[PDB]
């Protein structure tokens, strides 16, 4: 699994590989990673497959009790709900979790969660354990405030070097780009991403 | 470590425990006592692991007894080893994991015969009119049976009794420093003085 | 794998005389072969003649000497301010180590002070209960180097009069404040060359019936 | 029972005439990956103490949110409290004391070393020890981790004792601390060649110099170096 | 132990505490760890003491054997390569530790060579508890290229700071000065910075302090034929 | 630790060492190891030393209360079985016991009970408990009559403890015996094992492999 | 246990003013068994001794192997052995056995004849010549000898001075160890004649 | 510790990261990893230190015969002398060697071997325990037959990009570049690099 | 099997052996003799671990008379007992370590003393008056000690180990059923009869 947040002028796109691995046996090969928690907010799981897919649903049904009674959240504030269901849970569960959210004073925003639960804020996250193999390719090709376009390429190309360099990476890399139009969904099948 | 026999004649119950207690690698007393009596007409005979055998077999006769008072009337044998079963059965699967098993030698006073049970450790009561736990019955089973016929006078018994202890001696590798014996009828218990 | 306890070293001493009674112990602490603290005094002055030391492991000998301190501020507040006896804070403090026995607090506790008949006392621990009012007693990493002088020259064991042929033993000696404090200084500085969590310095609290005084000497530095 | 998962690795500090002085690099190591960036070690806490937290990330940011707690706490019920019971580094001490051995207690361990160094209103310079093990102790220098090994002799020379305080200026003490860090960024791997540096003053107040960078640079005899041993 | 070796311009020095430790006992106020492999070449010992000195022993007769037969001054590379072919063989469960350095006509030369058999190269090494007391002290204070005199203070100012942080570091300090194309200086507790302190009373009393059971006088001579 | 009591007409002697020890370090060669139950009881220490100590004074305790509550001095057979419910609750937690109760009552006579920490509860009239309960039985077993005189009882408890101290690594430092009449125990003292181990050298004859 | 310390005994040895002093105790156990009150730890080969401290097996293994080695010296050289010589022939031995050792704690005493010199050595498992001439100290009680042979030491006495301070310095460490407290022999050693004194202690 | 060696027009340059680790103890500061093992064969070394060490003498060993007696080795030639000491000693060393060398008549060829022992003829390799975060960087950044200049610059950020993302990385960089002019030696020093 | 047991006399010495021979949980033969003759004045008794008893004894009882006959005279107990010291230190160093622990008793013809070595299985030997082994070696020891007498005639030497006979008998829980028990004198060595 690898996935990814990168912040950009108008937003954070939100990344994935969508294989998912039970031992050297693939489960389902189309997984979405990327996961709704609130209408602008978004989060990418990794890791242990269970536990995140649990955790994620709790911190749902905090933000979604937020809303109605304190007025909408922010990116901030959905990495804190996270970082205490990981910290407390932390000897029970494994969870790697990339929060982005989008707001229309912060813009897009990318908090990381490790294993053992810290909040942390970066102009760009990636995590998984097929992300192990794009760190010195990330941090020359990342650009603070890049153009839209070149975020396309940019998480296009670095997912697709993380799927040629681990073997539990792969299948269909799926984007969910959060910008103040709203949520826009992509896909890029393997016949696009790999030749380029 | 530590013997229980038991045989039934045709009016009385021979109940017989080793008189010696190993804790350790010395013998720690060498002539005890190693049977309580739940009421006036049932006995146990006990042995298993160290002190557990004395807290099973007081707590035991405390609640047997109790319902002998109330009602007025012993309970019978059928009754009391199934009790005892009971509690077995909850222990094993308790915190506390006694390991405890007991011969339950009574007489039945309304039926009018004696009766033999053996109740395991774990759990499980069944009657047997030659039974034993440990290693005494890994000799006695075999035994016992040959020279038993169904019946049996208390004199017979009793010296069929004392040919088992014979056995025990020479082939097993523990001394029991005598045995006691206390004979269980419809008149009471009583101490029988027996090598 | 987490594990609750450590080792800290030091070592400390208490030696009973014949109307004082002296606690001492370094002041270096240790961890594998990191020099922690030069000086922490882990002789404390708990009040009322009671000195108390709570040697080995750390942690547990810094929460059992303030949960002490505690006890006795609580002995005044009840019992209305009377003095708290050396024999009688020897019982609470065995009631402190049965107060989480099953997890078991690895110091090596002595304290000392006087009686109600102004006697020396001191009164050394087993980590989980256990106490018995000794005349000598080392706790802590160099109490296996310091143990067997004492015994030779507080109790003169093995020892007799010159050319009797060990028919008459050497007679006890009445054993001075002075005298004493000469005594541990030596123990200490042998315990400084020949074992390697002893040294740097040494804190000697000196208990009498006029109050509780203090003497530091430093030691070899290794 | 909590195992490390990203951890901060070594805090220096020392003490001086007329204050103290704490510093760390700023790194969360994930183990042998170098994870994270621009991780900040060291919190101001009140204004008159920096605390400085080293292990776990996890364990330190629950830690971070105890401290901000304490201000808090403090500025609760009382008509002032910057001088009337006003936060002293030896409270704070006390406060995280406890805490970590009651978490010790209960076999989770927030799996730290802190340092926690100060000045109090009292104008007694403060410096003490706080760990996983709950072990404390109070010295003029300290360092946890690695640093304890390595860079804590050396500092030893500039302060053995508690009567070569006096003699020791704020130049020469900030001098010593950065050549600690030379030391750590050469010969740790969980050592970045960032690094901050705080001097809690009872006279200057706080000052937090961020973003430092590790200087006086010795690469150039490295070319001299041919072999492992027996090569030309 | 703590172990230096400082390369300096002209030649390498190499020193080591004097104090030996087998457990929490000290075993000895004074031992020597710098032991002569040959006669330009010195090293000290950390790890496994027993290991360390029988090593020395060892490869010390195999390079005394070999500079005997080509009839010339013996190599530090030649005793470099001895070591690590022998530590290897048994694959490192032989627990000996040793920082080599000395001097030969190709030059003055300081090597580490681990327990499996490992090997490395600086201008400065340490390896034993203390390798790291030591270690900060060397990187530090050092600067490329040094004088003899400035050498001395420096080796034994990283085993001075070894002493008094690390806990089985202690006692004199022992330095061997090897300079090129010169005779070895084995120069002696250079350092003294532990002394022995006086005790407050004397120990010892008369005799028959010690009672006696026996008393019998035993043969260690020959005998004669009166 | 070797501690052995034996009933006899006179009273019961209880007889314990003084040897703490640790493992090759010697913990302590004076130590009190018989707990002062009440005036009437005394228990013996061995087995965990720390859990001896605290649990035979807080037998004690309930002692006094038993006594208050009833009006009546507690019997032996009450005072063992109260220890022996209190250590079955905790059993397989780190406690182990190694303890005689040993009383002698004006409505019971003379009466041992061993306690154990597993729950056993055994009436004898000879116990052997410790390392060195291996060693006490055979000096103990040879020379003991019921009818015994009390100086030549304790002279036999004194026989004991020396040759099994001996003997025993773990045990030696000094010899305190304790004879419990009905009004009590009196305390005989402490006989350093050194010094005394030679007079009755002299006097027995045995001991012939030390050659003093 | 491990096995190196199961069976007891301890050596001490000391130098004086031209006199070297070693003394052991005579106490074997087995675990907690005492077995024998003789059981002499000091041996010696011409006038060189040896002390050997250790796993009761090894001890008179050693023992003779050492008189095996010693004998074939004395007569191939026309020479005794002396002190300094002998002790790198102990190192050598053990290291033998490098793997899988004999375990043992051997102390020399000596005076070397043509030097006049009090010499003591010191050993291990696998075996090491630990060097100090103060005072070498081995066996089950070796952290507690330490100690008090710190204390006591005086460094140069007159020889019956010497016997005051070794025994006394023995007596106190065997008392407070579990696996000693029977028996000694002292061995005060001098270039005329060599005294053993079987001391009056106590037993445990 | 990455080691890397690249392919191009003239040659093959070996580099290397000179930090050497034994736990989180740097044991030395600078140890170059790229020990001749011929004249115009190098060879680099990651994994375990010991092990690699003990086989890289044993090779030099058997090419000191294979030109005294056959006339010149090759890279091919060499890298099999290695593969045949690690698979027969697959159960008691863990080395992990790329070796690379310069013909005359076949230009630079680089054959890893890898921990069990393979020869794996590739245009470039990368191995060892910091080579495992580059791996996206090298593919995508790589091309064939690059000049020389062009050929430092891409090792340089590689090997740069390793120290930034491993911990068991640093020290100086070493570059051995074999080519027909010589061997020529290169360091580099991080105030440099760290930029770059 | 577990008691093995020597006292040594004034002109004398006295081995006792085991008869039983516990093998799992049945006493397989309770007459079984676990010595052999070395020499005509030595006797050597063997007990320990089942497997290496039976042949260890057979071994140095071979190589012993081979001694004997080779050089035309018996070899004196000092000389014997040395010998099998010299093969248990090997065999620890061995392959399999055998666990036969020996006491070699033997009347010394040339000095005209009785001498006795016990051999613990390391390899230790050591010459005691008294002497066992096991667990039965821990009881024994202490009543020896208190009522030996520096010299003694061999029919009161057959009282007082009959008195540890009977000490050993009550206290430890194994059936050694009885001992046999072997004088070894110097005109010969016979067998006495004991209950």
Known sequence: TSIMAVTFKDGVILGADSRTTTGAYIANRVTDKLTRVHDKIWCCRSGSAADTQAIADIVQYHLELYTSQYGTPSTETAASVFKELCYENKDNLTAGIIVAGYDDKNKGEVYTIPLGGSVHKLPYAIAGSGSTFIYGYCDKNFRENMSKEETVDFIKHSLSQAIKWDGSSGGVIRMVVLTAAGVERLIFYPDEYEQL | MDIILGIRVQDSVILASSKAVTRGISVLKDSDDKTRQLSPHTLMSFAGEAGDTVQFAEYIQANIQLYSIREDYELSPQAVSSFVRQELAKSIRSRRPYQVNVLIGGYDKKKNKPELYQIDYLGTKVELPYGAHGYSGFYTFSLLDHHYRPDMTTEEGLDLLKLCVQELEKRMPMDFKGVIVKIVDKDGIRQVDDF | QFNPYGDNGGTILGIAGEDFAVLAGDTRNITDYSINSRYEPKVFDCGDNIVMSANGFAADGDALVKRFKNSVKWYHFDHNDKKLSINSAARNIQHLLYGKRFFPYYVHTIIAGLDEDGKGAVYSFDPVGSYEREQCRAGGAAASLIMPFLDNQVNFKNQYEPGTNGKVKKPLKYLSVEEVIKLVRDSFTSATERHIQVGDGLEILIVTKDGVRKEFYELKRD | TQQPIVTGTSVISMKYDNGVIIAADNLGSYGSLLRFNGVERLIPVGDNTVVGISGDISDMQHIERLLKDLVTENAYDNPLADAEEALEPSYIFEYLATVMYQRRSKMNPLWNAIIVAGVQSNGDQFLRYVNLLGVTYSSPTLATGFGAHMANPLLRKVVDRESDIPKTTVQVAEEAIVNAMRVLYYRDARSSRNFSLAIIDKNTGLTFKKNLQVENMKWDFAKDIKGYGTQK | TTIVGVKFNNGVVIAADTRSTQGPIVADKNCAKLHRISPKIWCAGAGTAADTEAVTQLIGSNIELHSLYTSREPRVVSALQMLKQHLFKYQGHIGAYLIVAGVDPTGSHLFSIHAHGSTDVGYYLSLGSGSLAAMAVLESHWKQDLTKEEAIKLASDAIQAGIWNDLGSGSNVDVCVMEIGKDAEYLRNYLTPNVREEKQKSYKFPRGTTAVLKESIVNICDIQEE | ?212 | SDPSSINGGIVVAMTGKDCVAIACDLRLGSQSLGVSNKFEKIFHYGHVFLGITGLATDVTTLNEMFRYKTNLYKLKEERAIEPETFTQLVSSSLYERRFGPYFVGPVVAGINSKSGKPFIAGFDLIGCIDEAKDFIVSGTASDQLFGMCESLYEPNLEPEDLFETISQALLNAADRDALSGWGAVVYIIKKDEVVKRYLKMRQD
């Open chain 6, 1 to 212: 630790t070797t501690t052995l009591a034996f009933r006899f007409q006179g009273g019961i002697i209880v007889a314990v060492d003084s040897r703490a020890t640790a493992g090759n370090w010697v913990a302590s060669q004076t130590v009190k190891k018989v707990i002062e139950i009440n005036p009437f009881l005394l228990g013996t220490m061995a087995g965990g030393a720390a859990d001896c100590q605290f649990w035979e004074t807080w037998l004690g305790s309930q002692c006094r209360l038993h006594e208050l509550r009833e009006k009546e001095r507690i019997s032996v057979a009450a005072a063992s079985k109260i220890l022996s419910n209190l250590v079955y609750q905790y059993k397989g937690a780190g406690l182990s016991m190694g303890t005689m109760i040993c009383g002698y009552t004006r409505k019971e006579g003379p009466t041992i009970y061993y306690v154990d920490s597993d729950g056993t509860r055994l009436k004898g009239d000879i116990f052997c408990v410790g390392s060195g309960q291996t060693f006490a039985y055979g000096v103990l077993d040879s020379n003991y009559k019921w009818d015994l005189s009390v100086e030549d009882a304790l002279y036999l408890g004194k026989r004991s403890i020396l040759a099994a101290a001996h003997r025993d690594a773990y045990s030696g430092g000094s010899v305190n015996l304790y004879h419990v009449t009905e009004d009590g125990w009196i305390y005989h003292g402490n006989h350093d094992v050194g010094e005394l181990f030679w007079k009755v050298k002299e006097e027995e004859g045995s001991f012939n492999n030390v050659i003093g």
